[PDB]
Design a protein around this ligand. Sequence first.
Ligand code: 255
Length: 328
Amino acid sequence: NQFYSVEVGDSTFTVLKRYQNLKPIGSGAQGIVCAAYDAVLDRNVAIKKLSRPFQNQTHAKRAYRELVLMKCVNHKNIISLLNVFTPQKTLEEFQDVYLVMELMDANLCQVIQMELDHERMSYLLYQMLCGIKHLHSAGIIHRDLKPSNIVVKSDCTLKILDFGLARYYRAPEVILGMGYKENVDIWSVGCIMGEMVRHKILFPGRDYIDQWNKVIEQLGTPCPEFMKKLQPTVRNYVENRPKYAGLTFPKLFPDSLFPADSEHNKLKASQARDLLSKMLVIDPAKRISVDDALQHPYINVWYDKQLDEREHTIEEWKELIYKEVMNS
Ligand SMILES: CC(C)(C)NS(=O)(=O)c1ccc(-c2cnc3cccc(Nc4ccccn4)c3c2)cc1
């Protein structure tokens, strides 16, 4: 005990007395997050309620990954865990997990709405690449980066909110069910950057199939060598489609979208387009690496024991998560 309940959205948060003035913030698509005052720390914090951690295998794996990686990862561009708790006293009774994190000011959705500047943008992308690089060195490949799981303070420091997969920003190979590697996450960063420039989602598929049409309408049909890596049913569909030439990157991202009328501006316009052209590459074999995008002229101005293999039963996930909850 020392718990009380407050209604938040359609659910009930039960939290430690220390966390006061619970207020719903951002998208709740991946669990409800509240802003709160922590009276013990005397600071504001964010509290996420995990959404039905034991509804199934998928939810439980995802709950385990998120909690474990959030305890174990420590990096300036990755959200910090402050606390973890459950209102329930025993394993039998155990159903809810709460993560308390440092509070940021907004997600990238709100920053994309505002006008574009080069210095801000390259700083946001730099930090995105630092976070992603740090994840990759730890063996973590995300796969589901998007503006609403990236958060920012008013000073423009950026943190990645989550750890992704145990849709508009998804790499071609992920969507098409082929192998994936590190640079899967480069595709998502290209989508976000392009959207910072267009202020429009680049690839708005009104379904999972139309999505693909939107990609190659703008970028063009990939080479036959890309299509040879697809499973039979997917290759069939992909290669027997009207061939698209796509648009060049200057057409995809016109002069009117960028600051103009200074040598500096026209330079940064080209450096941004150039970067865009190496991130938004359908074939992962041809797409720039994280190390390379960080060394890119647009960005480099800023240079200075846990099961992922196995399936488990819900009860074994419950115990694995619970002990993770109880041991700090
Ligand atoms: C927090 C109270 C006590 C209400 N006043 S405040 O000035 O400290 C403050 C209020 C709201 C936010 C706020 C609003 N919208 C957000 C949308 C997405 C992500 C956020 N930050 C966040 C989201 C998840 C995990 C960690 N940080 C948001 C914060 C930040 C400070």
